[PDB]
């Protein structure tokens, strides 16, 4: 219902200095656009239209951005920030669960001592002469505002801009939409681990590990989401649920346990 394209921004930091450039990759996986993308860049009461004959828009101008592919609505807006401050908190545009998030914060051609990262306006971690904050496995526990502060040489301690880390799920929580939860004994019922992938992770292959009450049905994981059983007896009528995961098995979501009953 939402054919909205998306901008993929490289380098992944949404805020950069005045001396750099960033690439705006208007990616529409379905509804592919090799060219003819209307970049509706608005900064201050603007509607600057800069159409390009490719999918990439390398710019260096701050402001709100969005792309318009052929036959598709306008992209979800992305707020760039090209600032010439003294310390800037570099954050990824969008953080998904299980992503290896590195909240770097770097000065403007300076060495910053005693970098201290803040989350929700209180101390999170201390960095001795370090400009990198590392989150191994980002989850819902990691949200809210972030801003690192560090001492300059002798001018002033400086606090960076505030970024909002908002963890989004890579895919909707699975639901075990079996073909018929009341199959007469000896009939095939096709279990479906229904899951709508978030479009930002669309090239991701999904692994659907179906389950009985506690026994792993089938053989481990599989790419296909249709665990077509052949004949169901009164013995194997228990709770059924499926697990969905990405390639490294880092993000694992469990579908709610729906009961399957065999009619006789």
Ligand X SMILES: *[C@@H]1O[C@H](CO)[C@@H](O)[C@H](O)[C@H]1NC(C)=O
Ligand Y SMILES: *[C@@H]1O[C@H](CO[C@@H]2O[C@@H](C)[C@@H](O)[C@@H](O)[C@@H]2O)[C@@H](O[C@@H]2O[C@H](CO)[C@@H](O[C@@H]3O[C@H](CO[C@H]4O[C@H](CO)[C@@H](O)[C@H](O)[C@@H]4O[C@@H]4O[C@H](CO)[C@@H](O)[C@H](O)[C@H]4NC(C)=O)[C@@H](O)[C@H](O)[C@@H]3O)[C@H](O)[C@H]2NC(C)=O)[C@H](O)[C@H]1NC(C)=O
- Residue environment code for 187-225, b if the CB has 16+ CB neighbours within 10 A, otherwise e: eebebbbbbebbbbbeebebbbbbbeeeeeeeeeeeeeb
Map the footprint of another protein across residues 24-63, applying CB under 8 A. Answer: 42, 44-45
Q: Does 184 bind ligand X (CB under 6 A)?
A: no
> Which residue in 18, 60, 182, 216 binds another protein (CB under 8 A)?
182
- Residue environment code for 75-93, b if the CB has 16+ CB neighbours within 10 A, otherwise e: beebebebeeebbbbbbbb
State both tokens at 225: 């989401």
> Which residue in 36, 50, 134, 257 binds another protein (CB under 8 A)?
257
CA distance 57 to 69: 13
Q: Are 66 and 75 in contact (CB under 8 A)?
A: yes
Map the footprint of another protein across residues 68-107, applying CB under 8 A. Answer: 73-74, 77, 83, 85-88, 97
> How many residues interact with another protein (rule CB under 8 A)?
47
Question: Of 149 and 187, which CB lies nearer to ligand X in the complex structure?
Answer: 149
To the nearest whole angstrom, how small is the minimum distance from the Cβ of residue 131 to ligand X?
15
Q: Are 233 and 261 in contact (CB under 8 A)?
A: no
User: Contact letters (x/-) for ligand X, 109-128, by CB under 6 A?
Assistant: ----xx--------------
To the nearest whole angstrom, how small is the minimum distance from the Cβ of residue 39 to ligand Y?
27
Indicate the pairing of strand 226-228 with strand 239-245: unpaired
Closest residue to ligand X, judged by C-beta, is 114
Question: Of 215 and 219, which CB lies nearer to another protein in the complex structure?
Answer: 215
121 binds, among another protein, ligand X, ligand Y, none (CB under 5 to 8 A by kind): ligand Y
Map the footprint of ligand X across residues 85-114, applying CB under 6 A. Answer: 113-114
Binding site for ligand Y (CB under 6 A): 121, 161-162
Question: Of 29 and 126, which CB lies nearer to ligand X in the complex structure?
Answer: 126
114 binds, among another protein, ligand X, ligand Y, none (CB under 5 to 8 A by kind): ligand X
CA distance 104 to 117: 10
Question: Of 4 and 130, which CB lies nearer to another protein in the complex structure?
Answer: 4
Question: Of 106 and 201, which CB lies nearer to ligand Y in the complex structure?
Answer: 106
CA distance 164 to 17: 19
CA distance 190 to 228: 4
Distance from chain centroid for Cα 45 = 30
CA distance 22 to 63: 12
Question: Of 145 and 197, which CB lies nearer to ligand Y in the complex structure?
Answer: 145
**Residues of the shown chain interacting with ligand X in the complex, contacts defined by CB under 6 A:** 113-114, 151
């Amino acid at each position: 219902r939402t054919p909205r394209p998306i901008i993929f921004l490289q380098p992944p930091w949404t805020t950069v200095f005045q001396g750099e450039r960033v690439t705006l990759t208007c990616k529409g996986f379905r509804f592919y656009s090799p060219q003819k993308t209307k970049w509706y860049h608005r900064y201050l009461g603007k509607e600057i239209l800069r159409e390009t004959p490719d999918n990439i828009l390398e710019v260096q101008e701050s402001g709100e951005y969005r792309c318009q592919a052929q036959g598709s609505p306008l992209s979800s807006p992305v707020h760039l920030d090209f600032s010439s401050a003294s310390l800037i908190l570099q954050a990824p545009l969008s953080v998904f669960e299980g992503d290896s998030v590195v909240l770097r914060c770097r000065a403007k051609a300076e060495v910053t001592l005693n970098n201290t990262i803040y989350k929700n306006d209180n101390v999170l971690a201390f960095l001795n002469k370090r400009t990198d904050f590392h989150i191994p496995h980002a989850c819902l526990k990691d949200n809210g505002a972030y801003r690192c502060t560090g001492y300059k040489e002798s001018c002033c301690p400086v606090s960076s801009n505030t970024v909002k880390i908002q963890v989004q799920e890579p895919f909707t929580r699975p639901v075990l939409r079996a073909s018929s939860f009341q199959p007469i004994s000896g009939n095939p019922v096709t279990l479906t681990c229904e899951t709508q992938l978030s479009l930002e992770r669309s090239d991701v292959p999904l692994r659907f590990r179906f389950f009985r009450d506690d026994q792993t049905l089938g053989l481990g994981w599989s790419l296909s989401p249709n665990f077509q059983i052949t004949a169901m007896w009164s013995k194997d009528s228990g709770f059924y649920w499926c697990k969905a995961a990405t390639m490294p098995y880092s993000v694992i979501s469990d579908s709610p346990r729906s009961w399957i009953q065999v009619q006789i």
